[PDB]
């Protein structure tokens, strides 16, 4: 039968998205250098409150997750409200789910206003690659444990005996799966060898997204939700995304050596999201209170979907898995979609997912559904470019797609938005938006 | 289609030929004579087309690339000519394969052994997948055999001599990762692009223009080949006791190939089949392999299996941990253990921890997966959660009342679908069952000293045991990597019944003033590896002794050991390595060498007399007693089949494989011929060497226990 | 329904609570030393699952947590499910709430089962005081960033030229409020000075909590809930808590130097619970599923309550704030409340709370309530003692009291439970429980 999840409250009011704003992004070692991710938290929300003029006391919950966590701030959510002007009595917290924490926030917060304990929420996050809280070798940390617990002064020197010249070398950061050791590009790479992804089509997508995203910046459509960031030295503000290379050619892409597998890989820096920094803040709250305080929501909410799959082989197939289930819960179809989006983490896994969304045999045994998802039309797919352009600021990637589509489906007829996104740990995120 | 054979030629758009090996019959890609013929016809049609530039070879089988030579044609050889001819026809084809100028590539996936690497050395380039199933080697020495052609000469200078010799001798298994860094396989490529990754490798301009140099080039030449040869030969005879041929023969055939050129090895290895392939050692090894393979194919029982994914063990200690270890490390099944004292749980979890992390310590594994099987290790002190164990297995003391009480209560504390099994010491399974609510699901397993080395088990159903209970039990050992053998529920059984005369005679002989070292060295020279007393102590003196009163109460006084001498060691704290003192020196202060026995056991024994009995005489007596018991035990059909009986002794006790086994020995030694000299031994010492009536029956009239074909 | 809200699912099934298991708690040096927080989560989850007949494929969602976070494996939930035997498609997540992450998950887990997406959940967490990860000096964190992005060798030595001072000395761990600097004992002391708590008034609560808890150990009532721990050394298992000292007289530790002020510090180390090490897991799953697979839940659930207050004075009075709200959200009262529980994080800081619960003035004006929330009896208060005995792991004591009370109410043969707990950041956790 119909396995549909109505996203309407106890009183029947549907879950509504009223607005949001995006911090512009810059590469690592750029204007966004050495800035704590917590500081981006205050800045993105503080101006958003003022621009919105929504009261800071009416809000009753908010959760920003973040990749590249820092231990100096265990509960970043408390710090922002203690840093920003919102009421100290808000009962906020933080969560973490890979590169789709924005969507992770979307899930657990939309249900928060489903409970009736609250009425409004705030969505967003901040991750920056220019800042890393790196520590020393693990045993060196273990060594320091005993010395604090040591009681005899002469015992310490005996404890200092175990050392080496390479010990003072700190541990460099890592991105490959801890229990797997496969970097995310590697899993995208093996798919290119598994299913067949030429570099020319992967590089063409890098060109198309660059041409599309730069055109959106050239069209200036992403202006009313993109912040004009100021850097505390206050030298000059940032207005446009410098990551996008809108003046580029496919030939320039093809001269890049493959980064991970330098033997026969079909992915390079050209067709891979670079390390970008930024923040985001988006407002979610039920439609009834929006009319109660007299505000029109920037669209609405229809459904949500998330899947856990294998990491050993083909880990970025979450969107391939999650696509039919979301339309099942929405009672809709890929055809019944004005626009479609997916997080262009890699051009290889991009072509892989849409091909698998169109692979009927994929849904026959892996999913067992009645029919495969459908055909993803490239025209509506990532109209404003994709992640191969703006970049991958990790956490905010989910919300940034939320921003463009709701405006874009505002730029068009109401339609029904849809975004899909892969995540670490065999995780995929998918959902159908309304946008009226 | 009876004409297509397996090698199918396929020409793509480009100037390369992709070759698929699709055997129409068995799932393996084995070798027959006709394949060698038609591929010459196939390569003939390839030679006429000058447009091609390379060739790539495909498994065409998810199971294997090419299995190798099929042993049946080796069994079909009659004299030196056929054995030489198969090698010779292998040479000219492999020479013809190697004679082409264009690039030759073979893609390896699945298995590539024996005749598998035959073609691999005939290809300039080769790729094997990173899938962990692929493997390369020459499993030929085990059969008392050697590769058909090329292996002893063209592999050594392509990869080296030290690696080639040990692979031919030791016969280990080679992985794709270690083959790559060794240099045999040029590249390891993903199975997805395995065919396509070889496409451009076929397009590579050089067939072989810059072969890899030698870092170990120091001994390349005649300066150290003999020094290597003399040391490996001296160790070989020291290790092989001289009773295995095709060991020094390997040194000869390689030496003649290396020294005076390629053509010498061609005739030399062709000649090697002339004598080695037709040798009682060779036939014995070929027959036992077929005997070993059949029982693996044999499913033991006939009833359909039942779902089995949870197992309950009632008893820990060391045996509980060990049996759990294989069922966890190899079988990977969820398991629950209950012990009334956590110390057994704590030690057994330690026990498995002990054997584990040594592979990790060998850097062939990492701790990331190590903890994973630690998770399935589940321990408790209660009956709760045992309701969904598919099988329940007893590992507690052999008190029948204790066994009967626990089996009675475990039914109330476990599902009805659960089948009960017990590794009884001497108690019969039917006697153990007794007041059994589900006796048909009550069955008996039998394990041994730590069975990570021992790949055998015993199947002991009692009077009431559903064939499903057997069928489920039998399929366990297969997924446990063990051989299933169904035996009758009788006192002494089969392995233990024939092992007692092996050790009882050893105890009986040594007390008559014979040194252990001389009888031990001759016995291991004869073909029983590791001698009696060292086996006697480390397996457990008492557990070997415990069955003896049961054996004595079963058949007769023959199983009895001399009184007050075997038992005196037991109540002396001299109870083997488990007690830290027994027979052999256990301090091991002699640089961890072959320490001689404790110089205090001899005064404790009467040890009156001298050697007296000849070195082969004890060896022929030791084999006869088990043989006298082997025919005796199978006389009441304690074993389901003769092949099961043969396979049970040679891998469970240690009969010389080159002799084939107990009844391989009988027919080899003129069938009933040994009876008279055996009867003479009965006259020499006593009626303990009385012939079996069936042994008398087959011996007097002239018979072989195996009609079969000879 | 002006104050009470239903906690029943869409389909009419109450949110049933099923039993759980507790890792025994040990001091940072006596036991659990060097054992990470990962295997503790593995250790509890595997046996608790494989102690009843419950399968692992049925579970669809679960969350653990840790106030002390190890930088490796940022999403701790991924490792627990992958290694210990559960479905590889389970929705595992991790949340943050200092000293009350257990209760944070309880609301987070309940809201997930509220939506109907998931039918059953597992709740618990890990906390360890002996595997504290050591961070570097903040200065020796920016320098390592530049060297990775440096290009030439000459630039590196220029970068190293600024390394000086005692930067080799790492940063020892700190616990005080980062933006307040209050060490949770200094602000716990001022309460006693603010609200008049004497060291003679306390130090008998420390005794009475050491009692009624060692007796529980002596009575063995907490048998099936406390695991027997095993270690990779396997030297010996642990059966009883070693922190608990329900044998010293109340007049023994009163002659101890004050822990924090050391001048008029009416609290000391003895009457303040020490951080201990352990983990826990509990089964939370809906009423209908419990019956349709034939399982009785260990009681049921009534409601939840949490409060946020300004962090400048007496921040551990959240339970004083939280207590009436839980009772109104359940339509209940202390009179119809068999047995209560308090976290008792310190000597005092709860004596005020019960005093505040009984103080008419506090609830009159500080909350806007017409009346005080009522006083509570000691006899039905921490009958099994509290943190002053076994110890206080931050995120673990939450579910631990859940285990203690429900079985105690099972010992009491029904009734409604209630637990109160204070949390860092001026946060309080309280709720009404029900053992049917």
Swiss-Prot record, chains A, C:
Key words, A-Z: Acyltransferase, Cytoplasm, Fatty acid metabolism, Lipid degradation, Lipid metabolism, Transferase
Main location: cytoplasm
GO molecular function terms attached to this record: 3-hydroxyacyl-CoA dehydrogenase activity; acetyl-CoA C-acetyltransferase activity; acetyl-CoA C-acyltransferase activity; enoyl-CoA hydratase activity
Subcellular location: Cytoplasm
Assembly with partners or alone: Heterotetramer of two alpha chains (FadJ) and two beta chains (FadI).
Function according to Swiss-Prot or TrEMBL: Catalyzes the final step of fatty acid oxidation in which acetyl-CoA is released and the CoA ester of a fatty acid two carbons shorter is formed. Strongly involved in the anaerobic degradation of long and medium-chain fatty acids in the presence of nitrate and weakly involved in the aerobic degradation of long-chain fatty acids.
Annotated protein name in UniProt: 3-ketoacyl-CoA thiolase FadI
Lineage: Bacteria, Pseudomonadati, Pseudomonadota, Gammaproteobacteria, Enterobacterales
UniProtKB/Swiss-Prot annotation, chain B:
One GO term (biological process): fatty acid beta-oxidation
Disulfide bonds: none
Subcellular location: Cytoplasm
A single GO cellular-component term on record: fatty acid beta-oxidation multienzyme complex
Cross-referenced InterPro entries: 3-OHacyl-CoA_DH_CS, 3-OHacyl-CoA_DH_NAD-bd, 3HC_DH_C, 6-PGluconate_DH-like_C_sf, ClpP/crotonase-like_dom_sf, Enoyl-CoA_hydra/iso, FA_oxidation_alpha_subunit, FadJ
Keywords associated with the record: Cytoplasm, Fatty acid metabolism, Isomerase, Lipid degradation, Lipid metabolism, Lyase, Multifunctional enzyme, NAD, Oxidoreductase
Any one GO molecular function term: 3-hydroxyacyl-CoA dehydrogenase activity
Enoyl-CoA hydratase as annotated region, ranges: 1-190
This protein's record includes keyword Signal: no
Induction, per UniProt: Unlike the aerobic pathway, the anaerobic pathway is not strongly repressed by FadR regulatory protein.
Site residues, Important for catalytic activity: 118, 140
Pfam family of the protein (one): ECH_1
Pathway assigned in UniProt: Lipid metabolism; fatty acid beta-oxidation
Reactions mediated catalytically: a (3S)-3-hydroxyacyl-CoA = a (2E)-enoyl-CoA + H2O; a 4-saturated-(3S)-3-hydroxyacyl-CoA = a (3E)-enoyl-CoA + H2O; a (3S)-3-hydroxyacyl-CoA + NAD(+) = a 3-oxoacyl-CoA + NADH + H(+); (3S)-3-hydroxybutanoyl-CoA = (3R)-3-hydroxybutanoyl-CoA
UniProt keyword annotation of Transcription present: no
Region of interest (3-hydroxyacyl-CoA dehydrogenase), residue spans: 306-710
EC numbers: 4.2.1.17, 5.1.2.3, 1.1.1.35
Family annotation (NCBIfam families): FadJ, PRK11154.1
Similarity comment: family membership: In the N-terminal section; belongs to the enoyl-CoA hydratase/isomerase family.
Function of the molecule: Catalyzes the formation of a hydroxyacyl-CoA by addition of water on enoyl-CoA. Also exhibits 3-hydroxyacyl-CoA epimerase and 3-hydroxyacyl-CoA dehydrogenase activities. Strongly involved in the anaerobic degradation of long and medium-chain fatty acids in the presence of nitrate and weakly involved in the aerobic degradation of long-chain fatty acids.
Quaternary structure and interacting proteins, as annotated: Heterotetramer of two alpha chains (FadJ) and two beta chains (FadI).
Protein name per UniProt: Fatty acid oxidation complex subunit alpha
Originating species: Escherichia coli (strain K12)
């Amino acid at each position: 039968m119909g396995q549909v999840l109505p996203l309407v409250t106890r009183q029947g009011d549907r879950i509504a998205i009223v607005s949001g704003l995006r911090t512009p992004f810059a590469r690592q070692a750029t204007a966004f250098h050495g800035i704590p991710a917590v500081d981006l938290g205050k800045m993105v929300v503080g101006e958003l409150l003022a621009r919105s003029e929504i009261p800071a006391e009416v809000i009753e919950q908010l959760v920003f997750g973040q990749v590249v966590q820092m231990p100096e701030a265990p509960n970043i959510a408390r710090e922002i409200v203690l840093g920003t002007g919102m009421n100290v009595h808000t009962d906020a917290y933080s969560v973490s789910r890979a590169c789709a924490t924005s969507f992770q926030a979307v899930a657990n917060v939309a249900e928060s206003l489903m409970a009736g304990t609250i009425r409004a929420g705030i969505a967003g996050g901040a991750d920056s690659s220019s800042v890393l809280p790196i520590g020393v070798s693990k045993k060196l940390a273990r060594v320091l444990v005993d010395v604090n617990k040591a009681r005899t002064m002469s015992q310490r020197l005996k404890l200092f005996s175990r050392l080496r010249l390479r010990d003072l070398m700190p541990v460099p950061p890592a991105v490959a799966e801890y229990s797997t050791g496969l970097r995310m590009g590697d899993t995208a790479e093996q798919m290119a060898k598994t299913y067949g992804i030429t570099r020319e089509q992967q590089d063409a997508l890098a060109h198309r997204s660059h041409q599309r995203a730069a055109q959106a910046w050239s069209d200036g459509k992403l202006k009313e939700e993109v912040m004009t960031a100021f850097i505390p030295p206050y030298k000059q503000p940032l207005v446009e995304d410098n990551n996008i290379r809108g003046n580029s050619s496919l030939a320039d892409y093809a001269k890049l050596r493959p980064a991970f597998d330098r033997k026969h890989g079909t992915v390079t820096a050209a067709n891979s999201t670079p390390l970008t920094d930024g923040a985001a803040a988006v407002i979610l709250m039920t439609e009834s209170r929006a009319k109660e305080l007299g505000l029109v929501p920037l669209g609405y909410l229809r459904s949500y979907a998330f899947t856990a799959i294998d990491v050993w082989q083909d880990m970025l197939l979450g969107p391939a898995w999650s696509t039919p289930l979301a339309l099942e819960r929405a009672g809709l179809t890929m055809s019944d979609l004005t626009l479609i989006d997916m997080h262009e983490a890699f051009a290889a896994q991009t072509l892989a997912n849409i091909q698998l969304l169109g692979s009927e045999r994929f849904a026959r045994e892996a999913l067992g559904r009645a029919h495969a998802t459908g055909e993803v039309d490239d025209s509506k797919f990532n109209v404003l470019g994709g992640s191969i352009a703006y970049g991958h600021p990790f956490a905010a990637t989910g919300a940034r797609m939320i921003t463009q589509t709701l405006h874009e489906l505002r730029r068009r007829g109401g339609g029904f938005g849809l975004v899909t996104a892969c995540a670490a740990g065999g995780l995929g995120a998918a959902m159908v938006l309304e946008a009226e | 289609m009876e004409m297509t054979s397996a090698f199918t030629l396929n020409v793509r758009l480009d100037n390369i030929a992709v070759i698929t090996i699709d055997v129409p019959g068995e799932k393996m890609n084995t070798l027959k004579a006709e394949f060698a013929s038609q591929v010459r016809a196939i390569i003939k049609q390839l030679r006429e087309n000058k447009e091609l530039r390379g060739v790539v070879f495909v498994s065409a089988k998810p199971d294997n690339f090419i299995a190798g030579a099929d042993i049946n044609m080796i069994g079909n050889c009659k004299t030196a000519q056929e054995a030489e001819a198969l090698a010779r026809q292998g040479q000219q084809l492999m020479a013809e394969i190697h004679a082409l100028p264009i690039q030759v590539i073979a893609a390896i996936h699945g298995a590539c052994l024996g005749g598998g690497l035959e073609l691999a050395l005939a290809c300039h380039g080769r790729v094997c997948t990173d899938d962990p199933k692929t493997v390369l080697g020459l499993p030929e020495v085990q059969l008392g055999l050697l590769p058909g052609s090329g292996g002893t000469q063209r592999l050594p200078r392509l990869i080296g001599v030290s690696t080639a010799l040990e692979m031919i001798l030791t016969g280990k298994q080679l992985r794709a990762k270690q083959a790559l860094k060794l240099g045999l396989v040029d590249d390891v490529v993903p199975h997805s692009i395995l065919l396509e990754a070889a496409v451009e490798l076929a397009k590579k301009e050089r067939p072989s223009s810059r072969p890899l140099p030698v870092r170990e080039r120091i001994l390349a030449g005649p300066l150290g080949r003999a020094l290597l040869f003399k040391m490996v030969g001296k160790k070989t005879e020291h290790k092989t006791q001289g009773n295995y041929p095709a060991t020094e023969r390997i040194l000869e055939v390689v030496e003649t190939g290396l020294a005076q050129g390629t053509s010498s090895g061609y005739d030399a290895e062709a000649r090697a089949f002339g004598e080695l392939a037709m040798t009682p050692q060779s036939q014995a090894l070929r027959s036992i392999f077929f005997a070993s393979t059949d029982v693996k194919k044999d499913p033991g029982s006939d009833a359909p299996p039942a779902p089995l994914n949870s197992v309950g063990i009632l008893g820990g200690g060391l045996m509980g941990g060990g049996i759990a270890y294989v069922t966890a490390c190899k079988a990977g099944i969820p398991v629950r253990i209950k012990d009334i004292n956590p110390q057994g749980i704590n030690h057994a979890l330690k026990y498995s921890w002990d054997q584990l992390e040594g592979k990790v310590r060998r850097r062939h594994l990492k701790a990331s997966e190590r903890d994973k099987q630690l998770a399935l290790i589940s321990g408790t002190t209660d009956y709760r959660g045992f309701a969904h164990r598919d099988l329940i297995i007893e590992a507690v003391f052999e008190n029948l009342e204790l066994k009967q009480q626990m089996v009675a209560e475990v039914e109330q504390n476990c599902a009805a679908h659960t089948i009960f099994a017990s590794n009884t010491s001497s108690l019969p399974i039917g006697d153990i069952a007794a007041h059994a609510t589900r006796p048909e699901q009550v069955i008996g397993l039998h394990f041994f000293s730590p069975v990570e080395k021992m790949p055998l088990v015993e199947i002991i159903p009692h009077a009431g045991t559903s064939a499903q209970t057997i069928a489920t039990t039998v399929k366990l050992a297969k997924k446990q990597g063990k051989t299933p053998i169904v035996v009758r529920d009788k006192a002494g059984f089969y392995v233990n019944r024939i092992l007692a005369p092996y050790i009882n005679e050893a105890i009986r002989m040594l007390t008559q003033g014979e040194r252990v070292e001389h009888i031990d060295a001759a016995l291991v020279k004869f073909g029983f590896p590791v001698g009696p007393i060292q086996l006697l102590d480390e397996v457990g003196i008492d557990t070997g002794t415990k069955i003896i009163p049961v054996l004595e109460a079963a058949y007769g006084e023959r199983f009895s050991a001399p009184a007050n001498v075997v038992s005196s060691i037991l109540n002396d704290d001299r109870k083997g390595r488990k007690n830290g003192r027994g027979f052999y020196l256990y301090g091991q202060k002699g640089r961890k060498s072959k320490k001689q026995v404790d110089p205090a056991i001899y005064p404790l024994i009467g040890t009156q007399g001298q050697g007296r009995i000849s070195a082969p005489q004890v060896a022929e007596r030791c084999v006869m007693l088990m043989l006298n018991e082997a025919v005796r035990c199978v006389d009441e059909q304690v074993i389901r089949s003769v092949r099961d009986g043969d396979i049970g002794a040679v891998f469970g006790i240690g009969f010389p494989p080159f002799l084939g086994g107990p009844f391989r020995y009988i027919d080899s030694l003129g069938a009933g011929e040994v009876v008279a000299i055996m009867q003479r031994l009965a006259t020499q010492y006593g009626s303990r060497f009385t012939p079996c009536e069936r042994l008398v029956e087959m011996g007097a009239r002239g018979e072989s226990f195996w009609k079969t074909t000879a």
